[PDB]
Amino acid sequence: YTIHSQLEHLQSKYIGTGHADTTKWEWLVNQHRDSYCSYMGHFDLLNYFAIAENESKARVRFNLMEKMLQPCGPPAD
Amino acid sequence: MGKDYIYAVTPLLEDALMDRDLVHRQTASAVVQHMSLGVYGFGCEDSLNHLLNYVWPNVFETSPHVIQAVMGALEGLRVAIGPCRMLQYCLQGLFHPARKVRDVYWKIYNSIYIGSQDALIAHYPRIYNDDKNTYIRYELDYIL
Amino acid sequence: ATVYVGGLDEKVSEPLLWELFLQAGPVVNTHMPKDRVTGQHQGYGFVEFLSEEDADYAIKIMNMIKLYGKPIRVNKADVGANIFIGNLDPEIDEKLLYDTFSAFGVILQTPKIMRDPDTGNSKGYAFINFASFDASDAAIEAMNGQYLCNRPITVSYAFKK
Amino acid sequence: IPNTAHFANVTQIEDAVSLWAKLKLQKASERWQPDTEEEYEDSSGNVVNKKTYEDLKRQGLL
Amino acid sequence: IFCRKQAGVAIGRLCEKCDGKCVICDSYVRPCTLVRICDECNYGSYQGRCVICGGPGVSDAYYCKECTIQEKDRDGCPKIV
Amino acid sequence: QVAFPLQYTPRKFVIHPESNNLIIIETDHNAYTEATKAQRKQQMAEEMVEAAGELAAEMAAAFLNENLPESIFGAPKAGNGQWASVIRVMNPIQGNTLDLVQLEQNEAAFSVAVCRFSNTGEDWYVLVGVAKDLILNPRSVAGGFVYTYKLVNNGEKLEFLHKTPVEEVPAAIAPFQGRVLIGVGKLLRVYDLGKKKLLRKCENKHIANYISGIQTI
Amino acid sequence: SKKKLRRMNRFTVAELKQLVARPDVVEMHDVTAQDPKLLVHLKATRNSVPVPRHWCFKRKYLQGKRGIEKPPFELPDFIKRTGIQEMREALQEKEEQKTMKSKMREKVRPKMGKIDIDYQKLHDAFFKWQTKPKLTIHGDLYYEGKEFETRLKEKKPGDLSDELRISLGMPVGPNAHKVPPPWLIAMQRYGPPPSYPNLKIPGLNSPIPESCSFGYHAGGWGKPPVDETGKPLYGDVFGTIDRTPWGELE
Ligand SMILES: [Zn+2]
Ligand SMILES: [Zn+2]
Ligand SMILES: [Zn+2]
């Protein structure tokens, strides 16, 4: 259970993990944020979207980082 | 240089993963761990799939050594077989009625997530959007 | 659905029994729930083909199939019950014979056709072990002189050799 | 209603019939029926289905 | 129990009892990469000690090639304090 | 390399075996077609005339007379759901655009195939998928249309034949055994030919989400 | 009690099966799960792999395998071939007979190099005759007694076995084609079974298997069942590209 002190330290360590009660909302929103961080990181899906819509890389990443805030609806209750 | 004897050895590990004892399955699991980390990248993934089929049932276990060697086998097998295959093994029991099974699957998925959280972005399922949330990812299905 | 595996062969395994059940139709149950002592086959079994006509035609087919080499019958679950049948049609087959002579009873021996051995073509006689002597009676009566394939039938109780 | 798995653990019969009702609807949906789908233009530049095409075809026009 | 307060550029060392094994994997083979520890488990009387025995720093703690394939060596000072 | 321009983003293209002749389908998001381009330009010149003060001050002529080449000056194209298209018939060996079909306002072409149905003969037809009124980050559509052109002048200009309405963005077309397979979203439907519309001889309905390719041996 | 109001949210299994788009999945305890719409969409996704059987059970994993007797492991062929097993059997019997005193005498004066087995026999087994065992593809978890479960869902008629042929009266081997089984006889006589009307019998509703024989004795095909006008019982009881791989080694 000191293992648990370390393990909810691990929950505090890695944003996106889970535990047996985790809610569909936390799960899917964390995966959605991660999806955004990687669309930004990988230099080429950025071209994919930039080219799919008719936007430009500054436009693209600005949208993405705005969306990063409430990507999957408002919260659960 | 295990890419040679992996075939010779599989039917003996499947033999000893169908029960013989706790220690029998603890040890066959350790063997799977090290085979997987050796054969990383040489294409012998069908054999490690076959042995996943036999190791994964031991997931519900209690003895510390046994469940621990099992978890080790699944990290090794994660690098060697890829994280799709193991996210698919871990899909259905994330949201299960029970709590023993919910907890083991969230333990695994945590370790699958920490290491290689960035592949999974192309491995997550398609999870439909109900009324007041948006859950589909339209980013990924722009055509071009 | 439920079929009596009669003359249920000892070593003729329930696995191939169910494989033949499938090779005929709906293999849903193949069971010969045996003696609580022996383990070997108990002479009558339940074969469920979940379609009634499926089991019916599968039974018509797997009768006279040589289970343990011996004809065993799929049906509804030696004091001289042998009948002599002459003016015999040489143009028949053995399962056709079992289905033509099995209408009034079981056939504990398929029709043994007393054919010449020089060639392999018969001279027109046979004998058939049916279930009952009243069975041989009724069948031999309905086919006394009656319409056989090419040479009209003539049947009655059989002689002993 | 057949003893297929889809109803197992549904024990009340009105539930069973409405369940198998929507199931029926879905099976008929995802069936491809050439009668209503497979469609035929007559010679006259206007279109009908397979059924009606053969209907008026073999009752003496097409 | 682990320190895990994040990594640095200070190498770790092994007593001679503990000579040879990896820090976690407990291997004896094919070590690839050197170990690094945190300043806090670097200072003072803890300079040059055995991450495992606590004995004197003489031989260099290393990382079994499996541990580097799975990058369990990118977490920092794993000192069992 | 040697580069022969276009004006809308190129999506896909197919080949003309008779004359080596290339049919490109190009189309863009976030753009007005030629028509609406000029029309809202002159219309904004009109509403511009109306300052009510010297009447005298005239800039509308200079508006309609300026044309600042978007090739350097960025493209005067905007909105959110605002699509634009073109089909172009060009020669690979030299860059002449021997024909240009320039489509409707929001009718976005996303798939192309040249085929000869065998009920008829060697009169080729070009088929084009053209979705209608799409949005991208929600998803939504109005509907698809199947543009057939008869590809005449031995294959050096298209004349329209018919545009069959259809359920979805028709994102893939494939010539297949004297007919055409068509992916329209979740459906995989097999089409044969008329000249009132296009008639469906087969359907399959089991594809998971959305059919972005068909390749057939 | 709040768990009890969520328990009144705890819908009916019919509630579920009618709601859901794919009803095969819905199981017993599905409903006591905090998010059954998810749980069911997941369990109905492609390619995913369901929880083991045995989380419900009170017995642990293979304590049910406890009872039986089991036969020792069976080596691979290409390792038997190299003849190791007989070497080891012989050495075994030797050292089980020998007595303690002689054991230590051999400890102090060894029988050095009693045996030999040549390399290139080994190296050719492991590097020249090693072969793919039978593997099971993604998903098919092993559960207790699975190897005992015989096999099912071969509704096909042509499926015959050699022991099946022998203990039914039919032939085994290359003659499993040209042998119409004793059930195709009454297939020709009164029809094939009316739940396998989508099955055609070979020599009875199908054509002659390779080099079959027409005739009415034991060993032939008899009268292919036909109408009085000549059309068979069904099908035809008588009988009336470029698959090259792209990357392949020379
Ligand atoms: Zn280590
Ligand atoms: Zn520290
Ligand atoms: Zn030490």
Say if residues G47 and G53 touch (Cβ distance below 8 Å).
Answer: no
Q: Taking the domains of chain E in order of start, what are their residue ranges? A: 1-81
Q: How far is the CA of A48 from the centre of ligand 3 (A)?
A: 54
The token duo for C159 is: 């002689």
Assign residue F25 a region (left: φ > 0; alpha: ψ between -120 and 50; beta: otherwise).
beta
Say if residues F167 and F33 touch (Cβ distance below 8 Å).
Answer: no
CA distances from G51 to B71, B102, G140 (A): 16, 10, 11
Backbone angles phi, psi at E33, to 5 degrees: -120, 150
**CA B20 to CA G125: how far, in whole Å?**
28
| CA nearest to B78 within chain E | E70
- Torsion sign (Cα): D40, D46, D52, D56: negative
Do the chains contact at B91 and G42, CB–CB below 8 Å? yes
Element (H, E) at C30: strand C27-31
Instruction: List helix spans (H) across chain C.
Output: 14-24, 52-62, 94-101, 133-142
Determine C/G contact with 3+ CB pairs under 8 A as the test: yes
A2 within a domain of the structure (yes/no): no
Q: How far is the CA of E58 from the centre of ligand 3 (A)?
A: 9
| D-F contacts (CB, under 8 Å) | 26
Is D41's Cβ below 8 Å from some Cβ in F? yes
The alpha-carbon gap from D20 to the nearest alpha carbon of chain G, in Å, equals 9
The alpha-carbon gap from B114 to the nearest alpha carbon of chain A, in Å, equals 7
**CA E78 to CA E62: how far, in whole Å?**
12
Angle between the C52-62 and C14-24 helix axes, to the nearest 10 degrees? 120
CA G63 to chain centre: 25
Q: Which among C60, C61, C83, C74 has a CA at the least distance from the CA of C142?
A: C83
**CA A56 to CA F74: how far, in whole Å?**
12
- The strand pair at E62-64 and F160-166 is best described as unpaired
The token duo for F45 is: 């010149």
Angle between the A57-67 and A24-41 helix axes, to the nearest 10 degrees? 160
Task: Name C17's Cβ contacts closer than 8 Å, sequence gap at least 6.
Answer: C5, C30, C32, C45, C47
Of D9, D12, D22, the CB nearest to G28: D9
| Structure-derived torsion over alpha carbons of residues G190, G196, G199, G203, reported in degrees to the nearest 10 | -30
The token duo for B42 is: 């040489």
CA distances from C138 to C64, C100, C126, C134 (A): 22, 13, 17, 6
Q: Which residues of chain B lie closer than 8 angstroms to G6, CB-CB?
A: none
Say if residues C154 and C85 touch (Cβ distance below 8 Å).
Answer: yes
Say if residues E66 and E27 touch (Cβ distance below 8 Å).
Answer: yes
- The strand pair at C43-49 and C70-76 is best described as unpaired
Method: cryo-EM
Determine C/A contact with 3+ CB pairs under 8 A as the test: no
Q: What is the DSSP code (8-state) at residue G197?
A: T
The token duo for G152 is: 């099912």
Tokens 């059309």 found at: G231
Task: Name G149's Cβ contacts closer than 8 Å, sequence gap at least 6.
Answer: none
Residue G125 domain boundaries: 67-135
Do the chains contact at B144 and A20, CB–CB below 8 Å? no
- End-to-end Cα separation, chain G, in angstroms: 75
E67 annotated ligand binder = yes
Q: Which residues of chain G lie closer than 8 angstroms to A24, CB-CB?
A: 35, 38
The alpha-carbon gap from A76 to the nearest alpha carbon of chain G, in Å, equals 12
The token duo for C124 is: 């027109």
Residue type, G146: K
Backbone angles phi, psi at A26, to 5 degrees: -60, -45
Residue type, F87: I
Task: Name G150's Cβ contacts closer than 8 Å, sequence gap at least 6.
Answer: C15, C18
Task: Name F211's Cβ contacts closer than 8 Å, sequence gap at least 6.
Answer: F171, F172, F183, F184, F185, F186, F187, F188
Per-state percent for chain D, helix, strand, coil, to nearest 5: 50, 10, 40
Residue type, F107: E
Q: Which among A20, A22, A65 has a CA at the least distance from the CA of A46?
A: A65
Task: Name F213's Cβ contacts closer than 8 Å, sequence gap at least 6.
Answer: F172, F183
Q: Which among E38, E47, E43, E44 has a CA at the least distance from the CA of E76?
A: E38
**CA B92 to CA B97: how far, in whole Å?**
11
**CA F54 to CA C96: how far, in whole Å?**
113
Tokens 């580069």 found at: F3
The alpha-carbon gap from G20 to the nearest alpha carbon of chain D, in Å, equals 10
CA D26 to chain centre: 10
**Interface test mutation site (partner F, options A32, A54, A62, max chain F beta carbons within 10 A):** A54
Q: How far is the CA of E52 from the centre of ligand 2 (A)?
A: 14
Task: Name G136's Cβ contacts closer than 8 Å, sequence gap at least 6.
Answer: B50, B53
Other Cβ atoms closer than 10 A to G135? 16
Statement to judge: residues G59 and G90 lie in one domain: no
Three-state SS at C73:
strand
- G contact residues 15-54, partner A, Cβ 8 Å cutoff: 34-35, 38
Q: Which among F150, F105, F153 has a CA at the least distance from the CA of F130?
A: F105
Residue G159 forms beta bridges with which residues? none
CA distances from F129 to F15, F201, G240 (A): 16, 18, 45
Residue type, G4: K
The token duo for B12 is: 């003996």
Q: Which residues of chain B lie closer than 8 angstroms to F110, CB-CB?
A: 143
The alpha-carbon gap from B13 to the nearest alpha carbon of chain G, in Å, equals 11
Tokens 């069973």 found at: D16
Say if residues F38 and F102 touch (Cβ distance below 8 Å).
Answer: no
Q: Which among B40, B50, B59 has a CA at the least distance from the CA of B109?
A: B59
Burial per residue of C27-64, b for 16 or more beta-carbon CB atoms within 10 angstroms, e otherwise: bbbbebebeeeeeebebebebbbebeebbbbbbbbbbb
**Shortest-distance ligand to the CA of residue E67:** 1
Residue type, C68: Y
Do the chains contact at B136 and F139, CB–CB below 8 Å? yes
Residue type, C70: K
**CA B89 to CA B51: how far, in whole Å?**
13
DSSP per-residue codes, C117-143? TTTS-EEEEEEEEES-HHHHHHHHHHT
Backbone angles phi, psi at F160, to 5 degrees: -60, 145
**CA F162 to CA F140: how far, in whole Å?**
25
Geometric angle at alpha carbon G189, from G188 and G195, rounded to 5°: 70
**Interface test mutation site (partner E, options B31, B32, B34, B37, max chain E beta carbons within 10 A):** B37
The alpha-carbon gap from C26 to the nearest alpha carbon of chain G, in Å, equals 7
Give all strands (DSSP E) within C68-117, no chain letters.
70-76, 82-86, 107-115
**CA B115 to CA G31: how far, in whole Å?**
33
DSSP per-residue codes, E31-65? EEEE-EE-STTTSGGGTTBBTTT--B--B--EEEH
- B contact residues 21-40, partner A, Cβ 8 Å cutoff: none
Other Cβ atoms closer than 10 A to F125? 20
Burial per residue of F34-63, b for 16 or more beta-carbon CB atoms within 10 angstroms, e otherwise: eebeeeeeeeeeeeeeeeeeeeeeeeeeee
**CA C43 to CA B131: how far, in whole Å?**
64
Q: Which among A74, A73, A45 has a CA at the least distance from the CA of A64?
A: A45
The token duo for C79 is: 């004091």
A4 within a domain of the structure (yes/no): no
**For chain D, what's the residue count?**
62
Do the chains contact at G13 and D5, CB–CB below 8 Å? no
A47 within a domain of the structure (yes/no): yes
Backbone angles phi, psi at G9, to 5 degrees: -65, -20
**CA C132 to CA G24: how far, in whole Å?**
52
Q: How far is the CA of E69 from the centre of ligand 2 (A)?
A: 24
**CA G182 to CA G188: how far, in whole Å?**
10
Say if residues D19 and D27 touch (Cβ distance below 8 Å).
Answer: no
Say if residues G30 and G23 touch (Cβ distance below 8 Å).
Answer: no
Tokens 């436009």 found at: A59
**CA D41 to CA D56: how far, in whole Å?**
12
**CA C99 to CA C136: how far, in whole Å?**
14
Three-state SS at B49:
helix
Do the chains contact at A53 and F9, CB–CB below 8 Å? no
Do the chains contact at A51 and B144, CB–CB below 8 Å? yes
- Torsion sign (Cα): D2, D7, D11, D12: negative
Is F171's Cβ below 8 Å from some Cβ in B? yes
The alpha-carbon gap from D44 to the nearest alpha carbon of chain G, in Å, equals 39
Say if residues F168 and F145 touch (Cβ distance below 8 Å).
Answer: no
CA A60 to chain centre: 16
CA distances from A1 to A7, A8, A9, B99 (A): 9, 10, 12, 18
DSSP per-residue codes, G218-250? TTS-----B-SSS-BSSS-SS-------SS---
Residue A44 domain boundaries: 11-75
**Interface test mutation site (partner F, options D25, D27, D32, max chain F beta carbons within 10 A):** D32
Task: Name B75's Cβ contacts closer than 8 Å, sequence gap at least 6.
Answer: B33, B111, B115, E70
Instruction: List helix spans (H) across C32-76.
Output: 52-62
Domain count of the fold of chain A: 1
CA distances from G137 to B30, B52, F208, G78, G110 (A): 22, 10, 22, 24, 50
CA distances from D51 to A10, D9, F119, F179, F190 (A): 67, 41, 21, 21, 18
Q: Which among C151, C158, C156 has a CA at the least distance from the CA of C123?
A: C151
3-state secondary structure chain F: CCCCCCCCCEEEEECCCCCCCEEEEEEECCCCCHHHHHHHHHHHHHHHHCCCCCCCCCCHHHHHHCCCCHHHHCCCCCCCCCCEEEEEEECCCCCCCCEEECCCCCEEEEEEEEECCCCCCCCCEEEEEEEECCECCCCECCCEEEEEECCECCCCECCEEEEEEECCCCCEEEEECCEEEEEECCEEEEEEECCCCEEEEEEECCCCCCCCCCCCC
Q: How far is the CA of F77 from the centre of ligand 3 (A)?
A: 71
Q: Which among F13, A18, E41 has a CA at the least distance from the CA of B113?
A: A18
**CA B1 to CA G126: how far, in whole Å?**
13
Of F137, F138, F212, the CB nearest to B143: F212
**Interface test mutation site (partner G, options A22, A24, A27, max chain G beta carbons within 10 A):** A24
The token duo for F144 is: 């698809």
Q: Which among C51, B122, C140 has a CA at the least distance from the CA of G197?
A: C51
CA distances from B123 to B74, B84, G4 (A): 18, 6, 37
Element (H, E) at C47: strand C43-49
Other Cβ atoms closer than 10 A to B116? 18
Other Cβ atoms closer than 10 A to F127? 25
Backbone angles phi, psi at D25, to 5 degrees: -55, -40
Instruction: List helix spans (H) across B39-122.
Output: 45-55, 64-81, 83-89, 100-114
Do the chains contact at B138 and F210, CB–CB below 8 Å? no
Q: What is the DSSP code (8-state) at residue C82?
A: E
Is C57's Cβ below 8 Å from some Cβ in G? yes
A1 within a domain of the structure (yes/no): no
| Structure-derived torsion over alpha carbons of residues F148, F151, F152, F156, reported in degrees to the nearest 10 | 150
Assign residue G173 a region (left: φ > 0; alpha: ψ between -120 and 50; beta: otherwise).
left
| Structure-derived torsion over alpha carbons of residues G133, G134, G138, G140, reported in degrees to the nearest 10 | -140
Do the chains contact at A22 and B110, CB–CB below 8 Å? no
| CA nearest to F11 within chain A | A52
The token duo for G195 is: 């739940």
Q: How far is the CA of E21 from the centre of ligand 1 (A)?
A: 8
Say if residues G209 and G157 touch (Cβ distance below 8 Å).
Answer: no
E38 annotated ligand binder = yes
Say if residues G196 and C25 touch (Cβ distance below 8 Å).
Answer: yes
**CA G54 to CA B14: how far, in whole Å?**
19
E32 annotated ligand binder = no
**CA G232 to CA G224: how far, in whole Å?**
7
CA C113 to chain centre: 15
A6 within a domain of the structure (yes/no): no
Tokens 């004349």 found at: F159
Do the chains contact at D10 and G27, CB–CB below 8 Å? no
